[PDB]
Design a protein around this ligand. Structure first.
Ligand code: VIA
Ligand code: MG
Ligand code: ZN
Length: 324
């Protein structure tokens, strides 16, 4: 622990190119926990966030390890690896996808922090499950229960001694940054994505999209977050297939809880008896949620196409299995 920290602060950080983190095709699967922390340091560095905000090396390392530790290893999918991947998709969206110079430094700082923080202390279970099972977290919060908890955890970490990576900021810049972080985290609630999609899609469709407008900037950021959150849907096939079983593992565990705690029939997505239905379900997922989103991000930035390409290729593959 104090040893993992001394390991990390002493290590050489390889370049962005050596670590492959500018590729939309990036895979974490064969990296050690230590190597993922190294990648993260690089991400903060090449977005000019260490330089622009006076982050001490030792402090960023301690924060990165604090985050990593507050994810739950026993949770099939919503653990550190997902948080890390989400951040890597953000980093590629900013660098390879060229979103970077459409945003301010404060926004980028917020997004990257948010990407790594957005699922902190997840329990492998829904908002619905949390609500209906009367879990304590649903007395503190009445909408986006999990997402509000994730932000609270994030805030709690940014403010614990030795971990204050935002300390270089003025009271004004700090308040601004937290506000963006909160909105970014809240935006990773699929319900709120569905709720605001249509406005974003009409803006694109009528060629009225414009980042100069404060309201549209906010919207775009929310969309970006969803794009990164769902990004495993865009990876090469060996990766996507592997990641899908993890997500399914996580759902099936929830279905168990729903059968015993709530006494209801879990929905196919969530029933292990219909393990057979996974392909068809993934196709449905892609069609209803993902493709339209990556189609739009590609209108915002030509260079984000590889995300939509990846998504369409995974659709073909799942559809092939859906007919056996
Ligand atoms: C909170 C988890 C979001 C998510 N991440 N990832 C990687 C996936 C995924 O691969 N599949 C699904 C998924 C979504 C639907 S859904 O789009 O049909 N579902 C319908 C109802 N809405 C409200 C939510 C999504 C159905 C099946 C799924 O996976 C089974 C392996 N969700 C996620
Ligand atoms: Mg989430
Ligand atoms: Zn997530």
């Amino acid at each position: 622990e104090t040893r993992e920290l001394q390991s990390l602060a002493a290590a050489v950080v390889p370049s962005a190119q050596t670590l492959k983190i500018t590729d939309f095709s990036f895979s974490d699967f064969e990296l050690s926990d230590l190597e993922t922390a190294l990648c993260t340091i690089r991400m903060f560095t090449d977005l000019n966030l260490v330089q622009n905000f006076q982050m001490k090396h030792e402090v960023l390392c301690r924060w990165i390890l604090s985050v990593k530790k507050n994810y739950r290893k026993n949770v099939a999918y919503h653990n550190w690896r997902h948080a890390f991947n989400t951040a890597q998709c953000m980093f590629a969206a900013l660098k390879a996808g060229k979103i970077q110079n459409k945003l301010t430094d404060l926004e980028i700082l917020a997004l990257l922090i948010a990407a790594l923080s957005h699922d902190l202390d997840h329990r492998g279970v829904n908002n619905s499950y949390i609500q209906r099972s009367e879990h304590p977290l649903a007395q503190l919060y009445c909408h986006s229960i999990m997402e509000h908890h994730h932000f609270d955890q994030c805030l709690m970490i940014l403010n614990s001694p030795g971990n204050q990576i935002l300390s270089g900021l003025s009271i004004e810049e700090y308040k601004t940054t937290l506000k963006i972080i909160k909105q970014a985290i809240l935006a990773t609630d699929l319900a709120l994505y569905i709720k605001r999609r249509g406005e974003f899609f009409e803006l694109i469709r009528k060629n009225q999209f414009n980042l100069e407008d404060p309201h549209q900037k906010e919207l775009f950021l929310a969309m970006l977050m969803t794009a990164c959150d769902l990004s495993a849907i865009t990876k090469p096939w060996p990766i996507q297939q592997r990641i899908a079983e993890l997500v399914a593992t996580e759902f099936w565990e929830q279905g168990d809880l729903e059968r015993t705690v709530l006494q209801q029939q879990p929905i196919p997505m969530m029933d292990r008896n219909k393990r057979d239905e996974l392909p068809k379900l993934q196709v449905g997922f892609i069609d209803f949620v993902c493709t339209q989103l990556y189609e739009a991000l590609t209108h915002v930035s030509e260079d984000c196409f590889p995300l939509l390409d990846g998504c369409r290729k995974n659709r073909q593959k799942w559809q092939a299995l859906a007919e056996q």
